[PDB]
PDB file of C-alpha atoms in Angstrom:
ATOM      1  CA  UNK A   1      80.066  21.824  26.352  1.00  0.00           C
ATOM      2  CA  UNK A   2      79.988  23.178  30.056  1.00  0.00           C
ATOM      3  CA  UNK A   3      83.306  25.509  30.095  1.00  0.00           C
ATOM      4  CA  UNK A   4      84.435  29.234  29.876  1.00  0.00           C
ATOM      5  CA  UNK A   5      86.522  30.201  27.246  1.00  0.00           C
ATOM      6  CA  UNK A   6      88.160  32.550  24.878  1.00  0.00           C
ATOM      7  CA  UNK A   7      87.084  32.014  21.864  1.00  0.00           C
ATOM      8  CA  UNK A   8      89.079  30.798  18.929  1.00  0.00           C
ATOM      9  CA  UNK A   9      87.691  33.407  16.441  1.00  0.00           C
ATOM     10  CA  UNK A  10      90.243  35.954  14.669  1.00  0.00           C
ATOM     11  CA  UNK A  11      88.277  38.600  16.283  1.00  0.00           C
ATOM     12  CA  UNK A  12      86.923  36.456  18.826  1.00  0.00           C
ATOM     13  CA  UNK A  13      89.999  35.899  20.536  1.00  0.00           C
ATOM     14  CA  UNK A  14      89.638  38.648  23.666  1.00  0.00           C
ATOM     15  CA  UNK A  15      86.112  37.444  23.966  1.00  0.00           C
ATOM     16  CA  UNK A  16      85.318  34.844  27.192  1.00  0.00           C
ATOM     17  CA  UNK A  17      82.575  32.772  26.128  1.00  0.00           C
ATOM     18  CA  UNK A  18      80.406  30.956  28.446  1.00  0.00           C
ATOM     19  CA  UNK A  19      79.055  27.939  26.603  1.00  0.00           C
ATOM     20  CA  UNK A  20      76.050  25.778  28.351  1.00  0.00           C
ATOM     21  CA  UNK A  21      74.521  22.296  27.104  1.00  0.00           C
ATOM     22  CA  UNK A  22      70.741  22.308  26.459  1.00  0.00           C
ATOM     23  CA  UNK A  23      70.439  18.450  27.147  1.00  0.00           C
ATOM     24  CA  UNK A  24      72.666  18.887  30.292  1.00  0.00           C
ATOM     25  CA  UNK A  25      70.022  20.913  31.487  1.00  0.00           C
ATOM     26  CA  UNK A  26      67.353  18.600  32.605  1.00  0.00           C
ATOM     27  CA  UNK A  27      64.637  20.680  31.549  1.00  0.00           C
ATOM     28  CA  UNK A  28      62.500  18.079  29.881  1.00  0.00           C
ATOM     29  CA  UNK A  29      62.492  15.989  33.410  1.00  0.00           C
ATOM     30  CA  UNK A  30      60.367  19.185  34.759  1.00  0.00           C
ATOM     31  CA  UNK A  31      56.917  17.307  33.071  1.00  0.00           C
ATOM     32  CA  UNK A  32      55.865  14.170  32.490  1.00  0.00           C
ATOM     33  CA  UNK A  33      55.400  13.205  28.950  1.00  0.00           C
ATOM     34  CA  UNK A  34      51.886  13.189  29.185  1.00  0.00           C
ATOM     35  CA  UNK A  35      51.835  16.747  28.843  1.00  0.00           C
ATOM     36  CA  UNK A  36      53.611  16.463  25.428  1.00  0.00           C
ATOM     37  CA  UNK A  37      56.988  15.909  24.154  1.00  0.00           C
ATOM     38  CA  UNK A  38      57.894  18.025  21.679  1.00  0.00           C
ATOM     39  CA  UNK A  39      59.338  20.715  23.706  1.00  0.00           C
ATOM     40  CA  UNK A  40      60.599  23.988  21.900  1.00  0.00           C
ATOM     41  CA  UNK A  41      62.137  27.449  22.868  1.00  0.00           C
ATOM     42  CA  UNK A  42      60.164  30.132  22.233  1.00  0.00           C
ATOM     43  CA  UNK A  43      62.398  32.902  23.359  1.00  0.00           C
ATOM     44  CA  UNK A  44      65.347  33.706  25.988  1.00  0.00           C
ATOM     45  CA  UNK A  45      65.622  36.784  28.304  1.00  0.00           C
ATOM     46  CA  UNK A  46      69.162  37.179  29.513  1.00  0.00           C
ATOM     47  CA  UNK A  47      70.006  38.874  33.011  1.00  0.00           C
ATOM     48  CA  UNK A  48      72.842  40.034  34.542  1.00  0.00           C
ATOM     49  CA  UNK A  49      71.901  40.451  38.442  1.00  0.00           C
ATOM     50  CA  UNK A  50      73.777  44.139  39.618  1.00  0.00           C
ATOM     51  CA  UNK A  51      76.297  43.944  36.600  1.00  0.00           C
ATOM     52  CA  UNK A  52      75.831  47.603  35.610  1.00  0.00           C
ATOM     53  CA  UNK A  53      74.648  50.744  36.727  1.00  0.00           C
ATOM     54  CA  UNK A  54      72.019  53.137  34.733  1.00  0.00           C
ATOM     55  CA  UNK A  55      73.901  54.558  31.871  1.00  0.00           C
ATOM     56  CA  UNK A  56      76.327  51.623  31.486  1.00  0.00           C
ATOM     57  CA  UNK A  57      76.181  48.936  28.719  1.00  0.00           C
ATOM     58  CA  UNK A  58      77.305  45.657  28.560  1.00  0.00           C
ATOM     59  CA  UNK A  59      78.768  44.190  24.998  1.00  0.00           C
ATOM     60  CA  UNK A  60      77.501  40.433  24.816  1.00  0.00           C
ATOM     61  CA  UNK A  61      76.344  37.864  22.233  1.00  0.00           C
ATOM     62  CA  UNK A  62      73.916  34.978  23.185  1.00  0.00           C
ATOM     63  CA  UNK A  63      74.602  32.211  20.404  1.00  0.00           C
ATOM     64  CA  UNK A  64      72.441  29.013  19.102  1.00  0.00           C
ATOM     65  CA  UNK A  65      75.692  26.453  17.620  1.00  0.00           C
ATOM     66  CA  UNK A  66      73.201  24.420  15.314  1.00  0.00           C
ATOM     67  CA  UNK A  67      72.336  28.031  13.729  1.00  0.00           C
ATOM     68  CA  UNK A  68      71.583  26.214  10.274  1.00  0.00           C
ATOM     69  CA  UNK A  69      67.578  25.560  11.003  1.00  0.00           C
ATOM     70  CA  UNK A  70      67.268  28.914  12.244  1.00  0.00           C
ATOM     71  CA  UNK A  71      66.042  32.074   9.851  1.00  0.00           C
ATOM     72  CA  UNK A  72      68.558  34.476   9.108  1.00  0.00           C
ATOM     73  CA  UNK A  73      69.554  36.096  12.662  1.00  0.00           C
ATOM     74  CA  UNK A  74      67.299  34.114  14.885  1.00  0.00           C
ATOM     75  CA  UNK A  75      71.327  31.928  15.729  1.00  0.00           C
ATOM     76  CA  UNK A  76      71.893  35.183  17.872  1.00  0.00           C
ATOM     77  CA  UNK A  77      71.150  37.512  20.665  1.00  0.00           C
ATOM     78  CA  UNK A  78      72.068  40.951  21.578  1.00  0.00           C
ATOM     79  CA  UNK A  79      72.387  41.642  25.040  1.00  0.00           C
ATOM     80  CA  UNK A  80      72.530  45.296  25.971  1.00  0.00           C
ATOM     81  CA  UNK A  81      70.227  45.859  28.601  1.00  0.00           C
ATOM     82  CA  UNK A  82      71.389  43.262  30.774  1.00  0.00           C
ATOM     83  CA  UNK A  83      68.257  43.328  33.205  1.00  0.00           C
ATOM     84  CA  UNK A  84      66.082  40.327  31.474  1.00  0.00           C
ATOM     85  CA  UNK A  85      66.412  42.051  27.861  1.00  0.00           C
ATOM     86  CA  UNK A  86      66.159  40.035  24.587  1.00  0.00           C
ATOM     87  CA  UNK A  87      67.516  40.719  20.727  1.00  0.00           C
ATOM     88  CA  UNK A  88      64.767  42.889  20.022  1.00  0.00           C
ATOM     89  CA  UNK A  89      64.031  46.886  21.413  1.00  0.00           C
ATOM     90  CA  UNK A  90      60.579  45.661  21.962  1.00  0.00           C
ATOM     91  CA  UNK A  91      59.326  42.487  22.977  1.00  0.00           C
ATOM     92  CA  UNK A  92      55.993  41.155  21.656  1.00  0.00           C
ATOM     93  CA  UNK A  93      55.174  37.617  21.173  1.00  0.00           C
ATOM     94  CA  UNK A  94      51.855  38.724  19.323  1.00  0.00           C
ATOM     95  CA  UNK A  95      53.918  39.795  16.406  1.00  0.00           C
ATOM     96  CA  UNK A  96      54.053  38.373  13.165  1.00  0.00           C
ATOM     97  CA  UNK A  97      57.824  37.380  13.100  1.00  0.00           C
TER      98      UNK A  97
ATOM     99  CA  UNK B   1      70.405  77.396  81.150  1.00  0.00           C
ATOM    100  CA  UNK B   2      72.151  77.717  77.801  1.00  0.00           C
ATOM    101  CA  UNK B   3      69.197  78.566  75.713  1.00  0.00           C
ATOM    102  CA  UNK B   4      68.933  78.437  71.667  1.00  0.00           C
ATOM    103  CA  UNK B   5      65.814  78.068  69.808  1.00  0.00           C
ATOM    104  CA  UNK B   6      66.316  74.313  69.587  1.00  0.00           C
ATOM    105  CA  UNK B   7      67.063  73.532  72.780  1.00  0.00           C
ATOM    106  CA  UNK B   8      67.964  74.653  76.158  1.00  0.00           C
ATOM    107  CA  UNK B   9      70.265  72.352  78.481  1.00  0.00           C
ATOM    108  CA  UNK B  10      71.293  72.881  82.432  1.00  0.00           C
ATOM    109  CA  UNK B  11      74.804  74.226  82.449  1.00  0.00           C
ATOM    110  CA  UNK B  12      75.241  75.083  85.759  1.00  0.00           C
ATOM    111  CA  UNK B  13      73.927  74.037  89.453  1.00  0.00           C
ATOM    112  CA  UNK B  14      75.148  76.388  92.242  1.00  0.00           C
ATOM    113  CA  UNK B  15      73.929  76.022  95.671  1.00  0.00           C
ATOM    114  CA  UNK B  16      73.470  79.179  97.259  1.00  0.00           C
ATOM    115  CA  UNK B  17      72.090  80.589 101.029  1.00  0.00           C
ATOM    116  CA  UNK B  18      71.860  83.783 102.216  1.00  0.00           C
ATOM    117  CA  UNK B  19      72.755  86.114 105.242  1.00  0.00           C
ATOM    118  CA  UNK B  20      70.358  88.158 107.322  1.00  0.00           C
ATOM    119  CA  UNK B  21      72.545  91.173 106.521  1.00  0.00           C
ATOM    120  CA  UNK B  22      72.073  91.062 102.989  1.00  0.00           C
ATOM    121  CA  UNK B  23      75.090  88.742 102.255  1.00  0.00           C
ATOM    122  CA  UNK B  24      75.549  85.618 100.479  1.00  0.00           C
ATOM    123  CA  UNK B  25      77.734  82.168 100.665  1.00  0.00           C
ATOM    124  CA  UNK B  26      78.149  79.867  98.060  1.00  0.00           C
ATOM    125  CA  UNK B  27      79.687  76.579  96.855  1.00  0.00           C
ATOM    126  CA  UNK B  28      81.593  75.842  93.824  1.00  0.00           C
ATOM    127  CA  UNK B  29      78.813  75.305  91.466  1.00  0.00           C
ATOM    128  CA  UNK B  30      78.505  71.753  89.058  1.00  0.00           C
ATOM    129  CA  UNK B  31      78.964  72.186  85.824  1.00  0.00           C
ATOM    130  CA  UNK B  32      77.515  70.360  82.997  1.00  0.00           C
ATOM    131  CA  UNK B  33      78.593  70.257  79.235  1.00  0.00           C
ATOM    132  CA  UNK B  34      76.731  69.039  75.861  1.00  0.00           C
ATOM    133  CA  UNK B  35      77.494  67.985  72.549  1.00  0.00           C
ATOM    134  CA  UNK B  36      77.177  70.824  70.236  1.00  0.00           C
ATOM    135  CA  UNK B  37      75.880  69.848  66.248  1.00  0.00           C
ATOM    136  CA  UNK B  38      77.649  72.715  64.093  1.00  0.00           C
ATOM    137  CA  UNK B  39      77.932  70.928  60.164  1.00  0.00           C
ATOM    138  CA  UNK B  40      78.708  74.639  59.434  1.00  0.00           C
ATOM    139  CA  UNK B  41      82.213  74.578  60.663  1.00  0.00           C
ATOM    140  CA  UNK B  42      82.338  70.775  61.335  1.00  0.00           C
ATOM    141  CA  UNK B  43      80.457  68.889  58.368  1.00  0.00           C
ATOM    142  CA  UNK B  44      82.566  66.533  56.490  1.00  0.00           C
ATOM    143  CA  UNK B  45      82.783  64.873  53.062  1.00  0.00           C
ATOM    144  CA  UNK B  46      83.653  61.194  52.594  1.00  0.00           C
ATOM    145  CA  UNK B  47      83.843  59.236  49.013  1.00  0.00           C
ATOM    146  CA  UNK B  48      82.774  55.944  48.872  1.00  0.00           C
ATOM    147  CA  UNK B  49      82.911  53.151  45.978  1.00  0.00           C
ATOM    148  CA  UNK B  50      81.766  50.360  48.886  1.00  0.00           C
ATOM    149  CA  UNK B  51      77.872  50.524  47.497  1.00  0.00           C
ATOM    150  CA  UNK B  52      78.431  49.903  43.735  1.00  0.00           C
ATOM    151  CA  UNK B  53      75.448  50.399  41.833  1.00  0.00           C
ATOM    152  CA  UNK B  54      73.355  51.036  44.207  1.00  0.00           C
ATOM    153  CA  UNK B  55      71.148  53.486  43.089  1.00  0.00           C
ATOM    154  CA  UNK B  56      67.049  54.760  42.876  1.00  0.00           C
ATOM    155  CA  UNK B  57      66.671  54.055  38.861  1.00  0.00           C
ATOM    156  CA  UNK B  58      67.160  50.782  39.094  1.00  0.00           C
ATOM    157  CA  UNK B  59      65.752  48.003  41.503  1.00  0.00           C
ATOM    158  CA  UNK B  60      67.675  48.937  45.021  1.00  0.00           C
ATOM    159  CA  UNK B  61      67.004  49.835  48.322  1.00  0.00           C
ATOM    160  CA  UNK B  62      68.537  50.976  51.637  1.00  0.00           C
ATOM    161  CA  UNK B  63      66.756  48.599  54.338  1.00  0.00           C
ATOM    162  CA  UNK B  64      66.383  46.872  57.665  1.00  0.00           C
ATOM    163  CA  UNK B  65      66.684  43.013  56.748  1.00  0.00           C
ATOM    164  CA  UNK B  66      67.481  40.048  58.896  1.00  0.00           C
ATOM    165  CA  UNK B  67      68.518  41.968  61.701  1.00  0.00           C
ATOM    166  CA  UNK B  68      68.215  44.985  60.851  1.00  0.00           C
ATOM    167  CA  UNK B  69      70.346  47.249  63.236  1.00  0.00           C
ATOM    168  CA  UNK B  70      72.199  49.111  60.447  1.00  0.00           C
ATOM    169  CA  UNK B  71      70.789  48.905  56.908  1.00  0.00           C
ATOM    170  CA  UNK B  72      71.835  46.713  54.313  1.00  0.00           C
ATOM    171  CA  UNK B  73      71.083  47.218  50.349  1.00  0.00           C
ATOM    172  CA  UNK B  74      69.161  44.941  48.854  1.00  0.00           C
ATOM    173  CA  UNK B  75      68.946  44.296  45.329  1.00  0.00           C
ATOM    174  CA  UNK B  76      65.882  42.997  43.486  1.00  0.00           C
ATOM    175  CA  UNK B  77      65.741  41.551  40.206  1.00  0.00           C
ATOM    176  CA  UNK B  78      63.724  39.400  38.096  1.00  0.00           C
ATOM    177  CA  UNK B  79      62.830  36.058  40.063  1.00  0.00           C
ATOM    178  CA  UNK B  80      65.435  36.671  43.118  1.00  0.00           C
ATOM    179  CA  UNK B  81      66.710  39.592  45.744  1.00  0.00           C
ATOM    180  CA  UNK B  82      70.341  39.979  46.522  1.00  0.00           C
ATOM    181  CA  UNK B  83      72.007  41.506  49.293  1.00  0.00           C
ATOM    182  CA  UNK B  84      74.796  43.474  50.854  1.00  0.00           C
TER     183      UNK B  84
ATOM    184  CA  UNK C   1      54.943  29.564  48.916  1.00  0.00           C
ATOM    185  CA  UNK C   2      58.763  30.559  49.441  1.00  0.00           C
ATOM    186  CA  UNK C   3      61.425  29.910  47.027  1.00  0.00           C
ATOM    187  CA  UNK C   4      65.108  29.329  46.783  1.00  0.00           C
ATOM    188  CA  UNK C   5      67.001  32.470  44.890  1.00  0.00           C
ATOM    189  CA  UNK C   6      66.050  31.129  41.112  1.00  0.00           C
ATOM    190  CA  UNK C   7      63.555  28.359  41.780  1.00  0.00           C
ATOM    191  CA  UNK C   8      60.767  27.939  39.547  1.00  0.00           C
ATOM    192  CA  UNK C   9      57.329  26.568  40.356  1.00  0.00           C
ATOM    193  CA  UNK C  10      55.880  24.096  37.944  1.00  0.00           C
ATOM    194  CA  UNK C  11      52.071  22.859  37.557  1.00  0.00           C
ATOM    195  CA  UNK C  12      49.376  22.058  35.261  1.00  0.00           C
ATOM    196  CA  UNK C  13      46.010  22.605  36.118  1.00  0.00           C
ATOM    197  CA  UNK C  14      43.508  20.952  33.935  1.00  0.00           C
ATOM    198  CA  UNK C  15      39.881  19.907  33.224  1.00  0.00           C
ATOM    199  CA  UNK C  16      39.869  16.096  33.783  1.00  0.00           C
ATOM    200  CA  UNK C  17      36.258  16.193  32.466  1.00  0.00           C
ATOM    201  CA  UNK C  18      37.488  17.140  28.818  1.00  0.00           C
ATOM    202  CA  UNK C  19      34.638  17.172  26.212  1.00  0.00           C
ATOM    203  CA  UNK C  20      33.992  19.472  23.366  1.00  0.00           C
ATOM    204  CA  UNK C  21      36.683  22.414  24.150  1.00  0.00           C
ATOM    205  CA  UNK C  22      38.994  22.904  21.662  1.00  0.00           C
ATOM    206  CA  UNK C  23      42.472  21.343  21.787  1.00  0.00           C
ATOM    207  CA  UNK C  24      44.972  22.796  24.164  1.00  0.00           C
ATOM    208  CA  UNK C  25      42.291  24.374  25.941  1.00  0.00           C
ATOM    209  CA  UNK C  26      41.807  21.974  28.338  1.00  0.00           C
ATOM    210  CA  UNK C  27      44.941  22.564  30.477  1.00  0.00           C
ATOM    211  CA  UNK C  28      46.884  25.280  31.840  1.00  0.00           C
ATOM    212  CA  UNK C  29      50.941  25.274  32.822  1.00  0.00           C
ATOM    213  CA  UNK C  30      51.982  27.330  36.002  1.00  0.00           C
ATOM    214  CA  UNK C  31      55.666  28.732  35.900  1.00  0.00           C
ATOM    215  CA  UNK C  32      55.679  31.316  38.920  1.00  0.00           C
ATOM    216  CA  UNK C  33      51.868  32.002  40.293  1.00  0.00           C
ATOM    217  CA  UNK C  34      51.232  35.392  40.871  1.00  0.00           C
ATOM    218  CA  UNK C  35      47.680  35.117  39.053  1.00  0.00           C
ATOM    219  CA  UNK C  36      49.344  33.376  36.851  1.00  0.00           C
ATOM    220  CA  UNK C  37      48.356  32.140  32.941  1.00  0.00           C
ATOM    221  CA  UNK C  38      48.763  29.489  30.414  1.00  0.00           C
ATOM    222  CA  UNK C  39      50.427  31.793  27.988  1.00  0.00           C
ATOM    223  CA  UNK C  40      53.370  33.871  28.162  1.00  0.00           C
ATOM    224  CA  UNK C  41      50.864  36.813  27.603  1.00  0.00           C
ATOM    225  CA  UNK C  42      47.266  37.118  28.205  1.00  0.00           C
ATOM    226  CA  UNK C  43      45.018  38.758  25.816  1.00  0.00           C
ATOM    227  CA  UNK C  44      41.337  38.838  26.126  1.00  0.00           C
ATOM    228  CA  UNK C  45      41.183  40.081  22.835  1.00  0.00           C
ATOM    229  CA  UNK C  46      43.738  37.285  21.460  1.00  0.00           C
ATOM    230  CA  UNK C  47      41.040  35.876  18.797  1.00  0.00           C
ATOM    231  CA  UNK C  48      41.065  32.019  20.139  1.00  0.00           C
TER     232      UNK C  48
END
């Protein structure tokens, strides 16, 4: 689950995919479990250090694979931006949604 | 002295004496030369791809790091710099 | 302090002496300093 590849899709296929394990991560090692231990994403920013320029865009999909506990489009990601952006114009974690 | 309103440089050094008749002698006199700056017949254009993206919109700048000497471009981003 | 190109710094500050403040309130989780907070935005204003 740590690999670079094209993906198998039919439209898919021109597409490299970069696919990361969570678990692999060692994330939940940063605090003891004294602090809690259900630990949950709240939201991802995706960057793309000197990639583009002002006026260019970059086409690319950040994807959740166990999408079925997820509400309807909260499996996915649009990165445009490419300079710590998210899937939404504006970011507020105040809002309702 | 060459004058212009910029600057004036020594061009020439001539060592002269005189005669009691109203005369004079002289030696060959030492001449000095300067670099001239005319962009107006001598400026050049050069294209250049060698500093990507670099660019005032976005987080760069043209600076002195490590060393300094001739300056680099450093990149900044969220959480870590980069540079050239 | 200095950090590596995509370190993170992590900490919890907390009240050891925890009595009648509400849940949660008690302790606070550092991710990068820089007057840093326990939540991902700070409101004043936030209602809790």
């Amino acid at each position: 689950n740590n690999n670079l590849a094209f993906g198998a899709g039919t439209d898919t296929k021109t597409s490299l995919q970069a696919s990361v394990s969570f678990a692999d991560l060692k994330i939940r090692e940063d605090y003891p479990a004294s602090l809690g231990k259900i630990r949950r994403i709240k939201q991802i920013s995706v960057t793309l250090p000197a990639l583009l320029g002002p006026y260019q865009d970059v086409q690319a999909i950040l994807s959740y694979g166990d999408k079925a506990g997820l509400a309807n489009g909260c499996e996915a990601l649009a990165v445009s931006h490419g300079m710590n952006d998210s899937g939404q114009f504006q970011l507020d974690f105040n809002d309702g949604k | 002295y060459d004058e212009s309103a910029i600057a004036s440089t020594l061009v020439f050094v001539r060592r002269v004496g005189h005669e009691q008749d109203g005369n004079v002698v002289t030696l060959p006199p030492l001449e000095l030369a300067y670099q001239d700056f005319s962009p107006r017949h001598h400026a050049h254009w050069q294209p250049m791809d060698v500093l990507a993206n670099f660019n005032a919109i976005q987080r760069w700048q043209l600076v002195d790091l490590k060393g300094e000497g001739l300056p680099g471009l450093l990149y900044q981003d969220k959480g870590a710099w980069w540079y050239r």
